[PDB]
Design a protein around this ligand. Structure first.
Ligand SMILES: CCN(CC)c1cccc(NC(C)=O)c1
Ligand SMILES: [Mg+2]
Lengths: 150, 152
């Protein structure tokens, strides 16, 4: 159906962008709003309300650019805003080598049902935060599975 | 000012801030503003964005060696409609011979539409505008914004 084709197109765009960024060790933080509204965090960023594409996602996160510092928040199949604030987790159970990108992802996942994808700038590793937990060192297949499950 | 006029002023401010930044850094850019001649056929050649304008987004689009930086950004009123769009190349003999494809594309679209196109040269940082088949080069920041305000 149209809604199903649109959701798969968006999953494909996200996975292509994440793969590109992982290969080049480009840090990225991408939160997908679910049932818990995240308007107050969207409002802290730069408004886009843009169609999703792998190309736009890559262009947003290029290092030392205006939009790269902070989270992209997606809502209703469209990039709502970029460079958004997310709350930093104080969880003592996050891997001690990880920095603020991963703590922000975990932090938003503690107070919402959102799914956040993180690319490490140090390793290019891909992780997902949900429900207060960080799922690390994901393969391409694993990330896809999480998106389809979500 | 009505809301339409205030939105226009914010869009002009976003464009000028982006162009001034890219000029200083020698970031090549090609930015066409649709006017009364519709440009759907050219918008459809690019990557759809339909995004709210911001100086930050405009700058991020044209960063060299990125997916969106080659080809034209086409704006519709207060939105970035699409990026990496094709425009036709002008064969006009009044395009300075040293200029490359971005300037020829800008003059090209200006020959078949009433659009206003802004170009930043990656070679010199100079800013130019194509309108009605003519290329106006080496614009000051003040001249560019006066051209945009007059275009409405
Ligand atoms: C997925 C990798 N892709 C496809 C969008 C990519 C990445 C960087 C640059 C360019 N294309 C250019 C610079 O023209 C393309
Ligand atoms: Mg002159």
């Amino acid at each position: 159906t149209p809604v199903e084709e649109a959701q798969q197109k968006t999953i494909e765009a996200i996975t292509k962008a994440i793969n590109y960024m992982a290969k080049r060790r480009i840090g990225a933080l991408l939160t997908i709003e679910r049932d818990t509204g995240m308007g107050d965090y969207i409002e802290t960023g730069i408004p886009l309300n843009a169609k999703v594409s792998s190309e736009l996602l890559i262009n947003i996160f290029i290092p030392n650019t205006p939009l790269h510092d902070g989270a992209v928040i997606m809502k209703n199949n469209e990039i709502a805003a970029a460079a958004c604030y997310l709350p930093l987790s104080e969880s003592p159970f996050i891997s001690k080598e990880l920095g603020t990108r991963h703590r922000a992802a975990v932090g938003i996942s503690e107070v919402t049902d959102s799914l956040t994808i993180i690319v490490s700038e140090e390793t290019g590793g891909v992780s997902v935060a949900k429900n207060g937990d960080l799922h690390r060192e994901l393969t391409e297949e694993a990330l896809k599975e999480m998106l389809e499950a979500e």
